[PDB]
Design a protein around this ligand. Sequence first.
Ligand SMILES: CC(=O)N[C@@H]1[C@@H](O)[C@H](O)[C@@H](CO)O[C@@H]1O
Ligand SMILES: CC(=O)N[C@@H]1[C@@H](O)[C@H](O)[C@@H](CO)O[C@@H]1O
Ligand SMILES: [Zn+2]
Ligand SMILES: [Zn+2]
Lengths: 129, 134, 307
Amino acid sequence: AISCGSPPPILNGRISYYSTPIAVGTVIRYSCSGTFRLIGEKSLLCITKDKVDGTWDKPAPKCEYFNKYSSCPEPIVPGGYKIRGSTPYRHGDSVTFACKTNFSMNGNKSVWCQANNMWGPTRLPTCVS
Amino acid sequence: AISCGSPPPILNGRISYYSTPIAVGTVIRYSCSGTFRLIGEKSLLCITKDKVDGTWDKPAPKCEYFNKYSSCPEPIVPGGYKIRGSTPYRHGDSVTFACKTNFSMNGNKSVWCQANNMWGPTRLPTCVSVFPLE
Amino acid sequence: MLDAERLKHLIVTPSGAGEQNMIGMTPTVIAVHYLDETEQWEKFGLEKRQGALELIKKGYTQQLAFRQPSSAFAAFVKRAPSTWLTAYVVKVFSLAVNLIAIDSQVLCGAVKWLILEKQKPDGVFQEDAPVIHQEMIGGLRNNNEKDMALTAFVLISLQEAKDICEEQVNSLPGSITKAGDFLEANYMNLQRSYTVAIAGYALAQMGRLKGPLLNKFLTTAKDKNRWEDPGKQLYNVEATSYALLALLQLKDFDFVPPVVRWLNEQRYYGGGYGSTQATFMVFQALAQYQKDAPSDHQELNLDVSLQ
Ligand SMILES: CC(=O)N[C@@H]1[C@@H](O)[C@H](O)[C@@H](CO)O[C@@H]1O
Ligand SMILES: CC(=O)N[C@@H]1[C@@H](O)[C@H](O)[C@@H](CO)O[C@@H]1O
Ligand SMILES: [Zn+2]
Ligand SMILES: [Zn+2]
């Protein structure tokens, strides 16, 4: 049967318990200690895009030591708006976007405020007509 | 960086020559001999979704023995609308859909007209309401 | 049941912290809203209007001292923001928009926060930091059916700020639909007369109080004139005022009379400890009845200021 290999590790974090072999459809959950903040989506899904090999559906998220002083500027996406998360934007906070009518999204819809005061592991999504 | 392994083979078809190794971002093209019709996307892209594994973005398309009588009816998707494709739909022809305002698409946006008159390799795409309770 | 001296006692000077200031601001705001809407200043004394506008501005200005960076509110700036207080500020401020200068960044910033931070994917609004004066939230103090009761309460607030904020808050339309979907899907299961009245009004505003829902709403009334819950039925004036607003919204004029009559027999101008919601709501509802009356013969009762 199709499987995924060992999930990507996470420094200063934990990965939920999983059985072997890792079957398509398996969901893994990452988390961080109390003084750390998780940056990126917490659950990875074992999927198959070509019906032959298995891959996790996204990169593993990371744990950043908490920086109570960090703050990210308002994330703005022309053609779109926020459907989750609002100011102030602190370390570990997340924002989720949606595109206005007649606009379609490109890229990941959610971003995280990182310790270096910049948004998510990926670039802000874009909205095009 | 990352590379994709040997691509899926295609019965009664061939893959456009590609150089080795295969880096993410590389596109390869499938085609069927002339007495067959290609069902599925002809171009496969080497990508990485988790920054560790390199994979082909779709399964290999297939070659169906040509049937000149095959004719698919106009595909209809609730909450969606056709973007590409025009009647009549013959063997190997395809159409593409998009979801209307307030729906998200579940499935492949493009389907192909098969010898048995049924649409695409996958089930027609579906457009589901953005509103959970629907 | 109402006259000028009774209404005049509701004009008060606001003071206190983030919750206390709104308890004070409520009677004055609804009293002015009621007199303007019913066009009764001649009976009350139009020269008192200016003075009331000044107290309203004072209430508003003072409340800003408790506006947080998020645009949400709490009793004290050191305290975690209340979903309910923030929504109540929107409910009061929206009524004052053409009375004094209300900053849309303030009004709409609070609306935006409610949606972006306190509404679940399923549409329910959640309170993560309950107010200290549990006295001021009326029927919501009884935590039973809180997801439905609070969701209706916040949605009604959002409807008041919709036209003013829809431009600056793109998530507003979708938030309302989600809240509405949740209330509609779970309405039939309500047990309290209070929740039935408040969610009933919220659904009526969206044209969703129909069929079995409408029937439950109407049959829930006791003696066909009030929405009350046995055992500490202190929320009946508030519940029934929401219900009267739903009936007016539905133009269900044949069912309205016993309700207005019951409301008019209550000492609804009493004010006093814990009267904030009853006060805001009964004056909103009776003002609405009088505002609608000139267009519909069926609303013929006299619930106006008497000599
Ligand atoms: C809100 C908005 O921009 N909607 C318009 C709609 O009015 C119009 O009918 C349509 C035609 O393609 O384009 C967009 O969907
Ligand atoms: C084309 C269409 O249905 N647009 C609707 C809009 O009318 C509505 O206000 C909103 C929230 O329910 O959802 C969608 O944006
Ligand atoms: Zn925005
Ligand atoms: Zn947040």
